[PDB]
Amino acid sequence: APQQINDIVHRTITPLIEQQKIPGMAVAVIYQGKPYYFTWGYADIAKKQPVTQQTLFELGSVSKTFTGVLGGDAIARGEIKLSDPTTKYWPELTAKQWNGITLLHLATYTAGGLPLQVPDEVKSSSDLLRFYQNWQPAWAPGTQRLYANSSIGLFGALAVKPSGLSFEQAMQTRVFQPLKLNHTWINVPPAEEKNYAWGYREGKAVHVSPGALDAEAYGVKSTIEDMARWVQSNLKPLDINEKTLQQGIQLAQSRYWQTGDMYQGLGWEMLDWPVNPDSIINGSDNKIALAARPVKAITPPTPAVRASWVHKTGATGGFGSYVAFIPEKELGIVMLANKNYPNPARVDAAWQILNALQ
Numbered sequence: 213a214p215q216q217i218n219d220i221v222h223r224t225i226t227p228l229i230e231q232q233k234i235p236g237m238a239v240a241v242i243y244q245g246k247p248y249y250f251t252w253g254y255a256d257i258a259k260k261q262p263v264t265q266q267t268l269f270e271l272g273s274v275s276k277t278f279t280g281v282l283g284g285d286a287i288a289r290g291e292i293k294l295s296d297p298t299t300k301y302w303p304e305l306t307a308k309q310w311n312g313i314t315l316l317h318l319a320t321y322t323a324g325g326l327p328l329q330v331p332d333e334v335k336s337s338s339d340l341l342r343f344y345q346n347w348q349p350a351w352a353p354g355t356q357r358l359y360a361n362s363s364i365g366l367f368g369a370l371a372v373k374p375s376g377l378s379f380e381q382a383m384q385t386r387v388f389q390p391l392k393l394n395h396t397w398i399n400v401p402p403a404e405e406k407n408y409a410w411g412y413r414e415g416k417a418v419h420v421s422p423g424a425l426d427a428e429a430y431g432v433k434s435t436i437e438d439m440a441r442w443v444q445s446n447l448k449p450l451d452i453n454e455k456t457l458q459q460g461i462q463l464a465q466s467r468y469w470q471t472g473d474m475y476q477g478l479g480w481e482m483l484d485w486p487v488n489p490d491s492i493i494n495g496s497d498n499k500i501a502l503a504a505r506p507v508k509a510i511t512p513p514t515p516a517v518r519a520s521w522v523h524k525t526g527a528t529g530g531f532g533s534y535v536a537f538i539p540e541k542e543l544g545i546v547m548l549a550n551k552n553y554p555n556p557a558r559v560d561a562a563w564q565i566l567n568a569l570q
């Protein structure tokens with residue numbers, strides 16, 4: 213890699229790993245289109261396995277960017293419309309609060325206060341039906357944003373219903389395979405378990421627990437190489453040969469809602485470039501990111517703006533991830549760690565690296 217990339221990456225990540233006590237970390241920088249990879253530390257402390265470019269990390273909420281693109285692809289295929297009522301795809305959702313809640317509201321956390329977590333008590337799809345039937349919105353649709361796995365998770369499950377495919381099968385055949393994400397998984401196969409890092413929470417090795425809508429909201433595991441390819445695919449969608457996937461990527465980067473200086477896409481979140489770092493750094497703290505905020509509708513949504521900082525943070529119990537890119541500069545970064553450390557430390561590190569390279 214160009215020494216300037218090496219210099220900025222090492223000077224930024226080495227102190228981060230020390231301050232945050234991160235067992236293992238992988239970073240990719242995309243710079244003038246090409247990827248540069250960096251790895252530190254341990255995927256498995258007990259078995260002394262190092263992090264490599266083939267290590268699988270839990271992406272957590274970065275999985276929502278795949279869900280948003282997969283939904284976008286279903287729109288481009290004509291299988292669904294974001295303007296469709298939720299009840300078009302789940303007719304048993306007869307409770308009156310669902311009148312007026314569309315797939316767009318589900319995809320963008322604006323249905324009216326669907327909760328962050330699906331309750332652990334919910335297992336079967338009849339448990340899920342009961343949960344959504346009994347849920348009482350705090351707000352009218354399209355008035356406030358509350359980040360929610362129960363919101364975008366339901367969007368992902370419903371968006372693939374016309375295809376007849378399971379969510380995992382739609383994701384594999386329509387997103388992973390066309391993009392050659394051949395080491396990206398919803399369920400890690402036995403053959404790849406040797407590469408699956410452990411997460412670390414309070415010093416204990418942990419993996420993500422099963423839960424309802426987990427595949428749709430936080431289910432993806434991936435390598436730093438596949439994630440750099442994911443970023444390149446989102447940086448330059450028009451290089452993608454499959455036409456509905458190309459349009460689906462663009463739909464996921466459209467600006468549907470505004471709160472503060474942040475715009476909500478499908479999975480992705482965006483700010484105007486150039487950004488105020490304090491705005492994305494403080495804004496990524498869960499005290500802001502997970503809070504209830506009024507939104508202004510973008511009527512009609514703005515198509516993907518090249519002069520944007522596009523990003524997503526992600527966590528599981530044992531992992532912390534971050535992806536960001538600037539299409540106008542052909543610049544991007546992926547940070548994958550097997551410890552869940554504070555979001556503002558992630559964004560600060562990413563800002564320092566990308567600002568130095570732009």
Ligand SMILES: O=C(O)Cc1cccc(NS(=O)(=O)c2cccc(Cl)c2O)c1
Nearest residue numbers: 272273420421429430525526527528529
């Ligand atoms: O480890 C597990 O068993 C479950 C688990 C724990 C913690 C986070 C997640 N991922 S989440 O629900 O999607 C999410 C929620 C809020 C913020 C972020 Cl950044 C995020 O990723 C999943």
